[PDB]
Amino acid sequence: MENFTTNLNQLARVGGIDPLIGREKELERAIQVLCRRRKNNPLLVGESGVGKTAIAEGLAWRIVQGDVPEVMADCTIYSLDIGSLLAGTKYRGDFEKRFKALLKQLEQDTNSILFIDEIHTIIGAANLIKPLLSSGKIRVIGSTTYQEFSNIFEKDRALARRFQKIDITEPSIEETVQIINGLKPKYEAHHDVRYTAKAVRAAVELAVKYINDRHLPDKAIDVIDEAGARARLMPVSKRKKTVNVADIESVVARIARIPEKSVSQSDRDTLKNLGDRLKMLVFGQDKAIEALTEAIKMARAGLGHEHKPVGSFLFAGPTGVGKTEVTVQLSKALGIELLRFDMSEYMERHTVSRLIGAPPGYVGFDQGGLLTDAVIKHPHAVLLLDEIEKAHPDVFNILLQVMDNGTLTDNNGRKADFRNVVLVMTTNAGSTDAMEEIKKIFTPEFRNRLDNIIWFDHLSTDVIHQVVDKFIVELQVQLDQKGVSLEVSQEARNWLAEKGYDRAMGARPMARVIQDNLKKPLANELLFGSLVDGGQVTVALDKEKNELTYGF
Amino acid sequence: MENFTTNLNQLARVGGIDPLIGREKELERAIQVLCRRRKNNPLLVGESGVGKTAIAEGLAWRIVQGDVPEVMADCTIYSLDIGSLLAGTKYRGDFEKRFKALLKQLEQDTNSILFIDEIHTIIGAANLIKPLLSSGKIRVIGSTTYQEFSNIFEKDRALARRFQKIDITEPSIEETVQIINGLKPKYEAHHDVRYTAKAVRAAVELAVKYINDRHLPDKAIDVIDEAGARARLMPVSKRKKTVNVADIESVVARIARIPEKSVSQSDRDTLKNLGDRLKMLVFGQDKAIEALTEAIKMARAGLGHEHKPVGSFLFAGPTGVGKTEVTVQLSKALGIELLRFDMSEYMERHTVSRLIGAPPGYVGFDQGGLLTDAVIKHPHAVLLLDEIEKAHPDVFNILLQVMDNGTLTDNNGRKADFRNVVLVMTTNAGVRETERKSIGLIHQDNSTDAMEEIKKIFTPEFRNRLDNIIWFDHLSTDVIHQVVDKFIVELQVQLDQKGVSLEVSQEARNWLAEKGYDRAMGARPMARVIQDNLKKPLANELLFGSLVDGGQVTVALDKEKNELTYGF
Ligand SMILES: Nc1ncnc2c1ncn2[C@@H]1O[C@H](COP(=O)(O)OP(=O)(O)O)[C@@H](O)[C@H]1O
Ligand SMILES: Nc1ncnc2c1ncn2[C@@H]1O[C@H](COP(=O)(O)OP(=O)(O)O)[C@@H](O)[C@H]1O
Ligand SMILES: Nc1ncnc2c1ncn2[C@@H]1O[C@H](COP(=O)(O)OP(=O)(O)O)[C@@H](O)[C@H]1O
């Protein structure tokens, strides 16, 4: 095996192997398994990036250090390269020849162990070692995921009985702190930096909160190494080597595809003026913004509940008052995604399965869910549900279980975390009369689970003028990107506000009115070339025409 | 030896390497990745020829200029030229002994970084770089594309725990112009010609609508090279060093073989008169054509949302009135391709997955979905989705997502550009309700408005995003007469090619037109009725001795409303 495997004893004795911390229980289990006469083959069951490989390295380290029982001494752990072993054969006899050469070079040392990292690729071959590792001469250290184990193992019972499953789980928060503490000095030596304990704990907690593609002990080490690299690059500004919590938050936002610094302390600057910058983007219903921002700050302060969503908000009031506008601006401010669903399509009995997914064996199972799928895709978004009072009661039971426990289960068994989303529900139901109306239509078991009910009052005529001026200034800045100025007379604004607004529809027709009255005429003048770079658009209302006139 | 490992730092010092234009944040990412103690091997994923070698050359140059932290300020970089070590052996043992020799040589050359061009092809002598992975003390920068990345790296833990993908996107228009200007003086020296900044500007602005082979910073330079070569070679006695935008469009017409006058010399002229251009080829539906042209013009004006698609229109009304022909002539007028899909085949979600390119449902998910690859091939084309009311509601979800954001990502790390695509769907829903016979003694009882059935079929979430909803009316008697006359002249061409002349009375044309027109299918049964009423008796005569090689047949009607055949 001179060219097929790596002598891990020769490697832990020189360097590169890092000390394994907090795995005394699993190491003892692997040792106890290795002391058996027959079937002394440990199998490490875990997931990607949990430190399965670190177990074998720590075992080789304790071997070369002598921190093992004397029965376990003198053993040599070999890590084979499957690239050299399996690939490049291309014929019916070469792979078995390589395999038998490896087995013979293992036979000369009856106390040596072979460790095959990720042993699910060589198996599906496997019938060549089942009689060798059954009870005869060879002990093998296996490392697989739970999925690869439950898929390839447990089917070949002859191989399931020839291996000892060692349940490697991901370490807890404090164990991650201890592991990264033990691993700190090496990165400090490489990057010539220093990590504060506050930065360490913050990095672990932020990796848990935002980075959900890997598991704890590896993504945490990755974020510290990345912070160390960033602080080693910072001498382009000739800064100090200390790595604080700010660098950790920056690198976290860099990695989790999250807006920069939108995680811990710039959030203080945003929540300082959250209600204000909302009231500059939404007009009217300002007490609604006040209560909503109050609840948002209440949740962000760390005083909320972990087994409930960030907030369960009901937006009661007539349409066109900006509930969706409040929601989308809340999403844009906090740098979180937006999830939008309309319960108009889930009012039927059979439609409920579209959210979580059909049970196995039925149509649309491999489609998975839509709610749980989006939530797993974007765990920090704000959930928007239009017309909740239309949803079929099964959707209401789903939402009840969500608001009560803050987690959902995909039809593939995955866990959808809702503790980081803001559950926002809007209705077009709508004061005390609106409250009594809400008591009717909504079951008390649902209302009792709500965080806060937010009422949206009717839009006032000055507010309609303000929103039409908002449309006008948006069109103005859009034209300024083109380079054409625009004038709109006051009576034109009043006519647009009165014509595009309905008490029963709110400001919804305002987009259509703005478009068909302003963009069309101006688009003709601009594209056909009558109005060019340097013109100024005028808007005049004639009561004898009720139309808008213009010029160059 | 040095014939296998090339230090490009010397190339940067001797002026052989120019500084890189832009993409400095990719340099910073690569540097901080090379700074790591573990997983310190950068990987460049992206399109082929977008400046990955250029990124590495600019990074090595910056190290020469010392634009890096003090840890890698003195480090040297090496480029791997596999061909030199590979060729000249033709012996597996010699191949492997050369591999060992180069491994020992680079290990002696420690404290250096080796750049592997197209590492995806080196990994798949796969046992040549595995010594570098097992050693780990050597940093390596590679280059790969999304296809090869998804094929090799995402399934291998030994590679994932070493490499980090650097998503290199194609630069903006102005960044491409900056790169063109940076590479311009040496080519002006080589090609002995002079191009303006407006010349290369119109060059890239034309390439973006001619590019169907490779992205921006891999083709505009080739356009410039072709322009220089032609301007130096096209005239024998003249040497037109002045290379203007007319020269660029001449090269575009010379290479793409589309007439420069139809695409490059017409920027807005056909757009300003698009409506009459369509009305000239489609008989009738003038109101629908006018509405469509006004909508697409309002879109082209640019006073809207740049992310949204060019146009999203639902063509309602009975089929067989030319809505597909309207779309065909719209595609031909804009000079853009026609990407069409008959939504009758996507009534099942396991086919919607194939439409998008979801991993399950279809083999070959490395190539992505149909719609995404199609819009990638032509980011300027028109989209036709017939019978849109048949598609699965997930197609409606995707259409809502596109009409909301104007971009569709793929499960292979690619994006779809819709901001230059116009989407057109056709349906005939509700038109079946215009022929619903009432119960009363009169039972006309309606000129049905299919709008209610339309809003019933398409959820308000979807149709709320329509840029317009175009309604197509019934074809007029003159329109039906023109279309039956077109069928007639087609039959006449066929018969004269056979050698038989044909004549038809105008009354017979009116009869065929008024008989073959169905308010449910428009003029589609016209081909069939023309066939059954004309081609059958003429074929009977053509085979049974009345006419064999030549002859002439006239057509007329009786008082019984029957076709009358007149033989030789
Ligand atoms: N208890 C620990 N002590 C020291 N390092 C650890 C510990 N647990 C995990 N690590 C580190 O986290 C990383 C885990 O990588 P690894 O488990 O080998 O990947 P995979 O499980 O996918 O094969 C390693 O860098 C490892 O050193
Ligand atoms: N309070 C408001 N302030 C500013 N604009 C508003 C407001 N309410 C409605 N609008 C305008 O109406 C359009 C969207 O209305 P929407 O939020 O969908 O109504 P609703 O949430 O009640 O269904 C937008 O053009 C928005 O600008
Ligand atoms: N105004 C017209 N000008 C020319 N041909 C027409 C016209 N109206 C109908 N036709 C003929 O009837 C056909 C109707 O096609 P269409 O309604 O688009 O169905 P499809 O979905 O298969 O494209 C046209 O292809 C054309 O041959």
Swiss-Prot record, chain A:
Residues 243-430 are annotated as: II. GO terms for biological process: cellular response to heat; protein quality control for misfolded or incompletely synthesized proteins; protein unfolding; proteolysis; response to oxidative stress. Residues 1-239 are annotated as: I. ATP binds at residues 46-53, 317-324. Transmembrane segments: none annotated. GO terms for cellular component: cytoplasm; cytosol; endopeptidase Clp complex. Keywords: ATP-binding, Chaperone, Nucleotide-binding, Repeat. GO terms for molecular function: ATP binding; ATP hydrolysis activity; ATP-dependent peptidase activity. Belongs to the ClpA/ClpB family. ATP-dependent specificity component of the ClpAP protease. It directs the protease to specific substrates. It has unfoldase activity. The primary function of the ClpA-ClpP complex appears to be the degradation of unfolded or abnormal proteins. Component of the ClpAP complex composed of six ClpA subunits assembled into a hexameric ring in the presence of ATP, and fourteen ClpP subunits arranged in two heptameric rings. Binds to ClpS. This is ATP-dependent Clp protease ATP-binding subunit ClpA. The lineage of its organism: Bacteria, Pseudomonadati, Pseudomonadota, Gammaproteobacteria, Enterobacterales.
Swiss-Prot record, chain B:
GO terms for cellular component: cytoplasm; cytosol; endopeptidase Clp complex. Residues 243-431 are annotated as: II. One of its GO terms (molecular function) is ATP hydrolysis activity. Signal peptide: none annotated. One of its GO terms (biological process) is response to oxidative stress. Keywords: ATP-binding, Chaperone, Nucleotide-binding, Repeat. Belongs to the ClpA/ClpB family. This is ATP-dependent Clp protease ATP-binding subunit ClpA. It comes from Escherichia coli (strain K12). The lineage of its organism: Bacteria, Pseudomonadati, Pseudomonadota, Gammaproteobacteria, Enterobacterales. The chain holds residues 169 to 746 of 758 of the full protein.
